[PDB]
Design a protein around this ligand. Structure first.
Ligand code: YB7
Lengths: 556, 412
């Protein structure tokens, strides 16, 4: 017999300050007990389990479900209670590889290891806590006691100990075979190469030899699959990849389930199908918290699902990564805070696509949103391809230059060029840095009563122009804004505006181009129309000449 | 050559921080660096029975073009015991702040010759990430004392005192302070001659590696704290006086006596912003008294080593950055301004990153602690990019300012 190399044992302990599991073995029907005595007998003679005596005080229940459409009973232990007590293991299973990241190899072989996790030894100091009891017929003898000698399925540490061991074994094979690539994700091992299919299946055979050296049995006859594959909701073809074809559900009174199964499903399609929008469908969700509630489609929803549909009609495919070619990412503004993007290396053939939704904010502008999307795409690309893509953005170079140079915050986007695909992201207004000579000076103020919620807003100017408007159902903050809105509405194309509202300053200096507040959007609409606007702040209740006389006028 | 016992403080598990994505070249650089470190015994591979993780990435230090490994030990440093067993840590030299020149020497490589407590090694675990989650991460843990850990200087300090006991023997003029992986060497000495006794220390360091090649030359006496200045003009517009009244009002929170009653009376009436107004004689007096008030330092502003140091930074344009360090609002313990010329004549984030590094350095020199930053930048932008310009072996804490402060005008 050719000797087996032993697989190194991973030391395991249960959580600090926790005992083992002691749960009682369910009452099973006579036929089910008969099934598990059969199963455990072969697995014992296979070295995978072994009977334990009455010393072991730990117990995990075991059940037997019956294989559907087949008369093969198979076994199930519910390790939930021992999983709760076991130490935490390390989490490298942080992500799922994205198809757009795979490099196009000419031959690729995938081998499933749904078998090998059971040939890997379990730490013997830990086997005592894997104990389970097969209840005897009529409960007239002590149930036969068993413990595991190897990684049990359904146990917390099995997937991490299995992959750690597998990687240990794969190192020298991959190192001494640089002409291949081996990726290992969950129970499968992906092997690709750029040599002829002949020397591929030879080195495939060689690897299975290499894993026999550790006693890990490998799929042989057929079994190991070659492209294409249905994998993790994708379709992996030799030259191409795309979303598994998954079609939209249909109802007349759409419930919460109805599109919790359709935005999460249109999110999926948005990674290869360009231009998929989700907003008018998700407003319907965050505003409720009932897993059963129905509510009709909004007037803008079925216009969007009609746009969605017009996209999921033909199959669009994605290319695999070529590390020798440049990475390109292109963004399009789609409206209502929605952004779409395509990542590719040559025109017309995307590696992947996607979208970005604006952050829940009170105010915002287009440049900030484009910046945020650039950052999202940047991190996605480093994840998938290990480098930052070159950007093509719908913003003029001079637009970006005036923005970043005059923005109070620090900001930056990496290397990028302008692409003239409207709607272009624009700067809609720019405040002056110094007062405008010859422009009317509007001293504005507003004030409200915390009890009646009544108030007044207005202005006094240097030409003697005045206005004070009475207002109902308003606050001090609203009137301060309204005063500025009035000055803008009533002044020429150039105007100096003096206020004491630190609240208003904070909103305007942030430079929003759209707002939740109806009143801010009016001000924004007025700013866009202006030629030059200088906004000056003074401290209140110092009676300053202008912002003393109008303060009085709005609280009278 | 034996371990010193190291714990964490009870009730606290080891760090479990997720590794963030890395560019391909950074991963490659780390693989090469860690393969050698593994060969030299400084680190060893680790199994999945280690649930702890600390992020790692790779840089290029100042005036050097080969990669260096940096481990963000910020979370582990929080959870590490405070080392006051024999000594209460290194007491900060108040004289280091007072020297005309101070220079920083990377001594971190000396930590790699002293073993770390075998019981503690499991908490230094880090992960070289893979691209696209293709292969699992390469996991290591430290066997030697790691650069960036707050325990490394604490443990090495006993064994570093002997290394300098000959040097401060001959030069009682020279204050030497150590912080993390850095040695700060200072003197009231001449500029050409301060370079001379330094390189001496460089070799006196090589003699004991028998049993680290360049320098950063700070000058903590070449500058000082910054006063509030008011304009000096012969003709004032309404706008000018409005801005003046605003800054005086703001400074009246810091200084007690700032009067703006004489100046604000000029502002009464609704005049055009660009209209000149002569200064009332009592307004001229009031501004004169405010000036004299602004020339004395703030009264009763004390450093408290029990509280956090806060650093705020304002972007002012054209490569200039202002900053203030304080513990209580309006009681700045230092203020200053950042200049330009250092990269990023078109990259705001590189400027801010360099600004954060300089402020931390000055903060290490003055108090022996790093401050918590308030950064004028969106979290998502900062987070994405700050590691590509970071060069220091330490890392401060920071939060993000999303509302434009009115104070940017007053520190301009
Ligand atoms: C034939 C095949 C190739 C692969 C693969 C391809 C690429 C990569 C990597 F490493 F490149 F990311 C890793 N594995 N998986 C499969 C596959 O059929 N897996 C089956 C069970 N063996 C299931 N997956 C999810 C299921 C229920 O949810 S059942």
């Amino acid at each position: 017999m050719v000797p087996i190399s032993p697989i190194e044992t991973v030391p395991v302990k249960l959580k600090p300050g926790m005992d083992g599991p002691k749960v009682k073995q369910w009452p099973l029907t006579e036929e089910k007990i008969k099934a598990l005595v059969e199963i455990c007998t072969e697995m014992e003679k296979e070295g995978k389990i072994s009977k334990i005596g009455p010393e072991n005080p730990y117990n995990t229940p075991v059940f037997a479900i019956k294989k559907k459409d087949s008369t093969k009973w198979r076994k199930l232990v519910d390790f939930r209670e021992l999983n709760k007590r076991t130490q935490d293991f390390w989490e490298v299973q942080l992500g799922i590889p994205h198809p757009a990241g795979l490099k196009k190899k000419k031959s690729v072989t995938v081998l499933d290891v749904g078998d090998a996790y059971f040939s890997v030894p379990l730490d013997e100091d830990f086997r005592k806590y894997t104990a389970f009891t097969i209840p005897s017929i009529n409960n007239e003898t002590p149930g036969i006691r068993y413990q595991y000698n190897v990684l049990p399925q359904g146990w917390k540490g099995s997937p991490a100990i299995f992959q750690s061991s597998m990687t240990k074994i794969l190192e020298p094979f991959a190192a001494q075979n640089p002409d291949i690539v081996i990726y290992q994700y969950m129970d499968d091992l992906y092997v690709g190469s750029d040599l002829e299919i002949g020397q591929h299946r030879t080195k495939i055979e060689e690897l299975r030899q290499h894993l026999l050296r550790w006693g890990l049995t490998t799929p042989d006859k057929k079994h190991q699959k070659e492209p294409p594959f249905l994998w993790m909701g994708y379709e992996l073809h030799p030259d191409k990849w795309t979303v598994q074809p998954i079609v939209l559900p249909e109802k007349d009174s759409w419930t919460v389930n109805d599109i919790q199964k359709l935005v999460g499903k249109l999110n999926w399609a948005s990674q290869i199908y360009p231009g998929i929008k989700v907003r008018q469908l998700s407003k319907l969700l965050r505003g409720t918290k009932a897993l059963t509630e129905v509510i009709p489609l909004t007037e803008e929803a079925e216009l969007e699902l009609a746009e969605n549909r017009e996209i999921l009609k033909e199959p669009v495919h994605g290319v695999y990564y070529d590390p020798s070619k440049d990475l390109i990412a292109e963004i399009q503004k789609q409206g209502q805070g929605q952004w779409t993007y395509q990542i590719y290396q040559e025109p017309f053939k995307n590696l992947k696509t996607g979208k970005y939704a604006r952050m829940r904010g009170a105010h915002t502008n287009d440049v900030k949103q484009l910046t945020e999307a650039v950052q999202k795409i940047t991190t996605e690309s480093i994840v998938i391809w290990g480098k930052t893509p070159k950007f093509k953005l719908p913003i003029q170079k001079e637009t970006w230059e005036t923005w970043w140079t005059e923005y109070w915050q620090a900001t930056w986007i990496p290397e990028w060029e302008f692409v003239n695909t409207p709607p272009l992201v624009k700067l809609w207004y720019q405040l002056e840095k110094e007062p405008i000579v010859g422009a009317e000076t509007f001293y504005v103020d507003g004030a409200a009563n915390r009890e009646t919620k009544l108030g007044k807003a207005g202005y006094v100017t240097n030409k003697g122009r005045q206005k004070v408007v009475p207002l109902t159902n308003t606050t001090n903050q609203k009137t301060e804004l309204q005063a500025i809105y009035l000055a803008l509405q009533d002044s020429g194309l150039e105007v100096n505006i003096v206020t004491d509202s630190q609240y208003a300053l904070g909103i305007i200096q942030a430079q929003p181009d759209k707002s939740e507040s109806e009143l801010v959007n009016q001000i924004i609409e007025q700013l866009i129309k202006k030629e030059k606007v200088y906004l000056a702040w003074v401290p209140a209740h110092k009676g300053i000449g202008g912002n003393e006389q109008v303060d009085k006028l709005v609280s009278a | 050559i034996e371990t010193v016992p190291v714990k964490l403080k009870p009730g606290m598990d080891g760090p479990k921080v997720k590794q963030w994505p890395l560019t391909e070249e950074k991963i490659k650089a780390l693989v090469e660096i860690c393969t050698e470190m593994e060969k030299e015994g400084k680190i060893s591979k680790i199994g999945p029975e280690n649930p702890y993780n600390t992020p790692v990435f790779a840089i290029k230090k100042k005036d050097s073009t080969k990669w260096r490994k940096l481990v963000d030990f910020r979370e582990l440093n929080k959870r590490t015991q405070d080392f006051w067993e024999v000594q209460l840590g290194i007491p900060h030299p108040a004289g280091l702040k007072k020297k005309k020149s101070v220079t920083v020497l990377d001594v971190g490589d000396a930590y790699f010759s002293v073993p770390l407590d075998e019981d503690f090694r499991k908490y230094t675990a880090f992960t070289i990430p893979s691209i696209n989650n293709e292969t699992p991460g390469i996991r290591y843990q430290y066997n030697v004392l790691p650069q960036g850990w707050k325990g490394s200087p604490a443990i090495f300090q006993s064994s570093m005192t002997k290394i300098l006991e000959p040097f401060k023997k001959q030069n009682p003029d020279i204050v030497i302070y150590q912080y993390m992986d850095d040695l700060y060497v200072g003197s009231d000495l001449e500029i050409g001659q301060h370079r001379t006794k330094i390189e001496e220390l460089r070799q006196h360091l090589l003699r004991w590696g028998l049993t680290l090649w360049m320098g950063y030359e700070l000058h903590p006496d070449k500058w000082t704290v910054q006063p509030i200045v008011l304009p000096e003009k012969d003709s004032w517009t309404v706008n000018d006086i409005q801005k003046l009244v605003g800054k005086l009002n703001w400074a009246s929170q810091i200084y007690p006596g700032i009067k703006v009653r004489q100046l604000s009376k000029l502002l009464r009436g609704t005049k055009a912003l660009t209209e000149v107004i002569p200064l009332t004689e009592e307004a001229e007096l009031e501004l004169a008294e405010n000036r004299e008030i602004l020339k004395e330092p703030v009264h009763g502003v004390y450093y408290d080593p029990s509280k956090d140091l806060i650093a705020e930074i304002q972007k002012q344009g054209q490569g200039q950055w202002t900053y203030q360090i304080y513990q209580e609002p309006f009681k700045n313990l230092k203020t200053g301004k950042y200049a330009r010329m250092r990269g990023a004549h078109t990259n705001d984030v590189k400027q801010l990153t360099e600004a954060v590094q300089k402020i931390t350095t000055e903060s290490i020199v003055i108090w022996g602690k790093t401050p918590k930053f308030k950064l004028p930048i969106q979290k998502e932008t900062w987070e994405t990019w700050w590691t590509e310009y970071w060069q220091a072996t330490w890392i401060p804490e920071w939060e993000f300012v999303n509302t434009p402060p009115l104070v940017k005008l007053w520190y301009q």
